[PDB]
Amino acid sequence: SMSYSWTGALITPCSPEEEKLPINPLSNSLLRYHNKVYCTTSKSASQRAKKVTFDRTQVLDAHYDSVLKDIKLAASKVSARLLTLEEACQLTPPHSARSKYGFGAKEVRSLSGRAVNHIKSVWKDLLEDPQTPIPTTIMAKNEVFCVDPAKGGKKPARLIVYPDLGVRVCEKMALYDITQKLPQAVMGASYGFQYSPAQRVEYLLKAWAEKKDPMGFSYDTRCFDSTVTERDIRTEESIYQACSLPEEARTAIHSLTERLYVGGPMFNSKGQTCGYRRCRASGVLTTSMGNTITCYVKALAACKAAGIVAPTMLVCGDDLVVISESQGTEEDERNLRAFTEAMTRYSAPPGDPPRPEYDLELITSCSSNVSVALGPRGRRRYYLTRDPTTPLARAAWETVRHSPINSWLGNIIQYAPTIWVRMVLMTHFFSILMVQDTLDQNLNFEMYGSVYSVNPLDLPAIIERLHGLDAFSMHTYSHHELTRVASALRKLGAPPLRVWKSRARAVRASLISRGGKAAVCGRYLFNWAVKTKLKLTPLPEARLLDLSSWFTVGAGGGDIFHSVSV
């Protein structure tokens, strides 16, 4: 079957869109080359629709069957429950797309009468009707990147396909508890979304170290959501149904599968029939969990088909890393081709073909890699980092155009030990917050595909809790890492790090003069900038934070919201 069919109706915006970075003193202080930063818009939606539309065939074999059998047995050890209406409501992000039935995210979160009665009505209809396709909206995502001339200039907008708010609340009631238990049960340590960055580093290091002669690769599936077949999606349902669930959840999950997950009609923002989907919906609760599980079953089976020896996998949705025992240079090349062929057969053909990698730092999980620096007592400390280009581009954009859900704060939190966050991101944003006088204000941000809310004045405590005190003391970064950062700064026309260091010293002084939590941010976040360093002690507030499942609660999962757990 074709992943999509189309009416010819346009994919339309709802609010005005901009594709060019506006030139402005605040953002220009971060980077001058504004013409290199673009935002994807509905203008390129049709380009993307062409790419994501293709035929799927799928031939499964005994290797696939055997893995799936193991997964279902592992799933049977899970007991999960319905979430109450109230719990499901509280998981809705503040700016979640409003319902067509006269209420929005605000009414959901406050348990308003109209919202609650409509949600009860949608749930009951799920219980009574397991057949009628549920309508979805298709929208072009507005995301910011830097131009890459080597790779064809500009990326077209990604497409998001989602049901009405009322349905989204119901998905949580039926399936959220599953997202919290099931992936760990079926793939254990291979499940990436359970890990803070430091835990991801620790897992990758252990995976690499346990091999006598390690070889790793990343598998990039060409448009993963589109390769997911109706059978794949019903197979996911059989995996959900293998858990001990109450009857009512079984009914609702089956309806949601047949009415929403397997496919359905797509409408534009003007309510015109746009097309029909027969693949993964990119904007449902199960997108991430479904992709992770299905990517795992296909990948593990493909390893067996290929003769990959002792595979240790890190799976985050469609992002797959495989670390294994090297069978020799030409053997590894051969085995990866066999892996690709098996993946292709399973309906997951490659975008870029996988390449055998023999250096840990080249292994990228969700664009991220392990690097090393020195901590305060000369110990080597490994930490997660990434190319700063995209984080910097979005930072500039979010400086001049305020985003209701930003990316910069997520980057600071995820990548706190990195030199680019510490010298550029922290410096720039704390300066900006003082200019706007909005330091003491909770902000919403995206991290691992879900929504969180943090007050920037709490960053010292949050960073200590996730990354340790050493995140404020890291030094002697690797040449590969420094070369990459410096090169990004030159590409974007950003000030060099020596300018960031002068700027930081002034930002640090101004924060300290404010006293309170602001002074704590000065002292801890900017201790790298001063000649005479302070001795930073563990913050009492860091012990009081429970962030221990902060990542797993996100479920990689989109329409999910969490504040800081103190």
From Swiss-Prot:
<feature type="binding site">
    <location>
        <position position="318"/>
    </location>
    <ligand>
        <name>Mg(2+) 2</name>
    </ligand>
</feature>
<feature type="binding site">
    <location>
        <position position="319"/>
    </location>
    <ligand>
        <name>Mg(2+) 2</name>
    </ligand>
</feature>
<comment type="subunit">
    <text>Homooligomer. Interacts with non-structural protein 5A. Interacts with host VAPB. Interacts with host PRK2/PKN2. Interacts with host HNRNPA1 and SEPT6; these interactions facilitate the viral replication. Part of the replication complex composed of NS2, NS3, NS4A, NS4B, NS5A and the RNA-directed RNA polymerase embedded in an ER-derived membranous web.</text>
</comment>
<feature type="domain" description="RdRp catalytic">
    <location>
        <begin position="214"/>
        <end position="332"/>
    </location>
</feature>
<feature type="binding site">
    <location>
        <position position="220"/>
    </location>
    <ligand>
        <name>Mg(2+) 2</name>
    </ligand>
</feature>
<protein>
    <recommendedName>
        <fullName>RNA-directed RNA polymerase</fullName>
    </recommendedName>
</protein>
<comment type="function">
    <text>RNA-dependent RNA polymerase that performs primer-template recognition and RNA synthesis during viral replication. Initiates RNA transcription/replication at a flavin adenine dinucleotide (FAD), resulting in a 5'- FAD cap on viral RNAs. In this way, recognition of viral 5' RNA by host pattern recognition receptors can be bypassed, thereby evading activation of antiviral pathways.</text>
</comment>
